[PDB]
Design goal:
The structure is cut from a larger assembly and holds 2 copies of chain A and 1 copy of chain C (42 residues). Chain A contains 8 helices and 12 strands. With 295 residues, chain A is an alpha+beta fold. In chain A, the strands form 3 sheets. In chain A, strands 2-4-5-1-3 form a 5-stranded mixed β-sheet, with no helix packed on it. In chain A, strands 6-12-11-7-8 form a 5-stranded antiparallel β-sheet. Chain A has a two-stranded antiparallel sheet with strand order 9-10. Chain A is elongated, with a radius of gyration of 24 Å. Chain A starts with 7 loop residues before the first strand and ends with a strand. In chain A, 29% of the residues are buried. Chain C has 42 residues and is mainly alpha-helical. Chain C has one helix spanning 27-39. The chains are: A alpha+beta (295), C mainly alpha (42). Chains A and B meet through helix 3, helix 5, helix 6, helix 7 and helix 8 of A and helix 1, helix 2, helix 3, helix 4 and helix 5 of B. Chain C: This is UL77 protein.
């Protein structure tokens, strides 16, 4: 087999107006997804507009986006986009596209955009029943919360009334992460969210079975003599209802804690999808950042 | 760290003496105890609190959720898991959302413990074991 | 009379005739088979 081309040329068949080439020159060293990995790909496969459906299933978009090969834009010119699928380990700069402020030392993940539509009025290379769609490069805790609220909106919507659902979407669509408010476009329950719910509930049932005689009564013994805002804030989400430990057997506790770590990781990987960039240093206007872990 | 409260007994003290040491490949290594002067530091307290909270919330919510899941049951793996919940055992909706959210917060506050990345792997070790040659893996 | 089972909670089925066997007998069918077995009987 011929090797995977690190220099991917994108071509264009539409008559490019001059403002379209201008807006295409803004997006140098940004992230775009492509599934083909050929050398002379067209423009239809480039981006994410090949997978935007009438369903607007954002969980379906997150499910497909993990399989797409991420590349970097370079050397934009007349009808030519030289893309570079980056090898793992080295470093080169990326550029933000959404209004998400970053830090140093944190990590970045790939994500489909939030409130995507004519609300922020993106004229991002619109031509002939096709738009250039950009995946968001979002930091780590935003990527944690944007799937945590997804899974909670999945789990709550069972066996309950629809007015509870319509009162629950508006309680769990805003995210006030880092001086900005984001809204998720139509969180809709599908079979993918169902199988994610099945994995989550099985793992937490198994870890509820896996809990030892001491780790479930640690807060129950702690909350008699301790006083802290952390312990008070975590106590009220529990029900109401010296002593001796029953049997200390640490040879069993090592195995219980090990398998409990496996169950906690098995719950954990539902919201910790992939670290795709580790940001090292940003631009002061935060338009770009030199980062590592490309690929 | 989990035995920080019941340290007054003697079985727990002998258990701390047991867990504090470790035998390895020609290693009689011993660790320090995370408790000093019968009170626990805030890092270990947050760790054990998060673990006890996720264990308690799993023991509370999951029976109700899988019992609700049996109406829309589509796999035999799901019906048999609530059977062991019934075996082991022998509210405002915003508070329920708060419980699920706090469960995921305690899950997020534990990834610094439950996993770790391998950094190096050894290609060759120098004789007398003072140095070794490793490829990087980040 | 009625059976006494080990596993407490029931399990749904998805199998085929070519997979593992299962007793699925409608009530009028077993009733009629009991009639046919009763009447068919130096």
């Amino acid at each position: 087999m011929a090797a995977m081309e690190a220099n991917i040329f994108c071509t264009f068949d539409h008559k490019l107006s001059i403002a379209d080439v201008g807006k295409l020159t803004k997006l140098v060293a940004a992230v775009v997804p492509i599934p083909q990995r050929l050398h002379l790909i067209k423009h239809y496969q480039l981006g994410l507009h090949q997978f935007v459906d009438h369903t607007r299933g954002y969980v379906r978009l997150r499910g497909l986006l993990r399989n797409m090969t991420l590349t970097l834009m370079r050397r934009v010119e007349g009808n030519q986009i030289l893309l570079h699928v980056p090898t793992h380990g080295l470093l080169y700069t990326v550029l933000n596209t959404g209004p998400v402020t970053w830090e140093k030392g944190d990590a970045l993940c790939v994500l489909p955009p939030l409130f995507h539509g004519p609300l922020a009025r993106e004229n991002l290379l619109t031509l002939g029943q096709w738009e250039l769609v950009l995946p968001w490069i979002v930091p780590m805790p935003l990527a944690l919360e944007i799937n945590q609220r997804l899974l909670i909106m999945g789990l709550f919507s069972l066996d309950r009334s629809y007015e509870e659902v319509k009162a629950a979407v508006q309680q769990l669509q805003t995210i006030t992460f880092r001086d900005a408010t984001f809204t998720i476009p139509d969180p809709v329950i599908d079979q993918h969210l169902l199988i994610d719910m099945k994995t989550a509930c099985l793992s937490m049932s198994m870890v509820a079975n896996l809990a030892s005689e001491l780790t479930m009564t640690y807060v129950r013994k702690l909350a008699l003599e301790d006083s802290s805002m952390l312990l008070v804030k975590c106590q009220e989400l529990l029900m109401r209802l010296p002593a001796r430990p029953q049997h200390v057997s640490p040879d069993d506790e090592i195995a219980r804690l090990s398998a409990l770590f496996v169950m906690l990781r098995q719950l954990d990987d539902l919201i910790r999808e992939q670290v795709v960039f580790t940001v090292c240093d940003v631009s002061p206007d935060n338009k770009s950042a030199t980062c590592i872990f490309k690929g | 760290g989990l035995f920080s409260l019941d340290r007054s007994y003697e079985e727990v003290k002998a258990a701390v003496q047991q867990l504090q040491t470790i035998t390895f490949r020609d290693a009689t290594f011993t660790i320090p105890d995370p408790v000093i002067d019968q009170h626990l530091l805030i890092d270990m307290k947050t760790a054990c609190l998060s673990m006890s909270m996720v264990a308690n919330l799993a023991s509370e919510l999951t029976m109700t959720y899988v019992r609700k899941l049996a109406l829309e049951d589509s796999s035999m793996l799901l019906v048999k898991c609530q059977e062991l919940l019934m075996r082991l055992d022998r509210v405002s909706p915003d508070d329920e959302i708060a419980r699920l959210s706090a469960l995921f917060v305690m899950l997020r506050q534990l990834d610094d413990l439950i996993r770790e990345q391998v950094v190096f792997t050894v290609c060759d070790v120098s004789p007398d074991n003072k140095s070794a040659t490793c490829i990087f893996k980040g | 009379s009625l059976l006494h089972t080990f596993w407490r909670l029931p399990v749904a089925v998805f199998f085929e005739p070519h997979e593992e066997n299962v007793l699925r007998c409608p009530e009028r069918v077993l009733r009629r088979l009991l009639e046919d077995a009763a009447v068919t009987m130096d």
